[PDB]
Amino acid sequence: LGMRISALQSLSDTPAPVQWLPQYTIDQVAVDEGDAMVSQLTQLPLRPDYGSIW
Amino acid sequence: ANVWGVRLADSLSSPTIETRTRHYTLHDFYSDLDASVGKEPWRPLRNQRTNEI
Q1: Residues ≥6 apart with Cβ < 8 Å to A16
Q2: Residue B18 contacts A where some CB pair is shorter than 8 Å
Q3: Dihedrals φ, ψ of B2, to 5°?
Q4: Cellular location of this protein (chain B) (predicted)?
Q5: Phi and psi at residue B32, in whole multiples of 5°?
Q6: How far apart are CA B17 and CA A34, in angstroms?
Q7: Cα–Cα nearest to A35, from A23, A44, A26, A27
Q8: Which residues on chain A are in Cβ contact (under 8 Å) with B20?
Q9: Residues forming beta bridges with residue B7, ordered by sequence position
Q10: Cα–Cα distance between B34 and B27 in angstroms, integer?
Q11: Where are the alpha helices (DSSP H) in chain B?
């Protein structure tokens, strides 16, 4: 089993979602497949909480 | 105008924007069945004079 040896560190549960910054690689996929899977995996229909623009 | 003792305001108004329909999903059904504090399927009604449900 080619895996490292260490013990997990316990963290307190975060009340709010944390920001994430993705990083890209050399692999590429067709745009249509990505759009189709975004449509398949989304929870897109809902009512957002509209904020104060000004 | 007064149809039958019912006075009507001079102005006219009506909504103009209609929201798109949201299809019912299984996750939504489970969320309704959870009966969370904010999403209870029952809305209480209160008597106006003395305020009891």
Answers
A1: none
A2: no
A3: -125, 95
A4: Virion
A5: -65, -40
A6: 32
A7: A44
A8: 45
A9: B2
A10: 10
A11: 26-34
A1 to chain B, closest Cα gap in Å: 38
CA angle A50, A37, A20 (to 5 degrees): 55
Determine contact, residues B20/B28, Cβ cutoff 8 Å.
no
Q: DSSP code of A26?
A: S
**Residue keyed to tokens 């489970």:** B30
In angstroms, rounded to a whole number, what is the distance separating the alpha carbons of residues B46 and A36? 48
CA distance A41 to A48: 18
Nearest-CA neighbor of B23 among A26, A43, A25, A34?
A: A43
Question: Which phi and psi (to 5°) does residue B33 adopt?
Answer: -70, -25
Resolution of this entry, Å:
3.4
Experimental approach: cryo-EM
By C-alpha distance, the chain A residue nearest B24 is A45
| Contact with chain A for residue B26, Cβ under 8 A | no
Using an 8 Å CB-CB cutoff, list chain B residues near A45.
20, 22-23
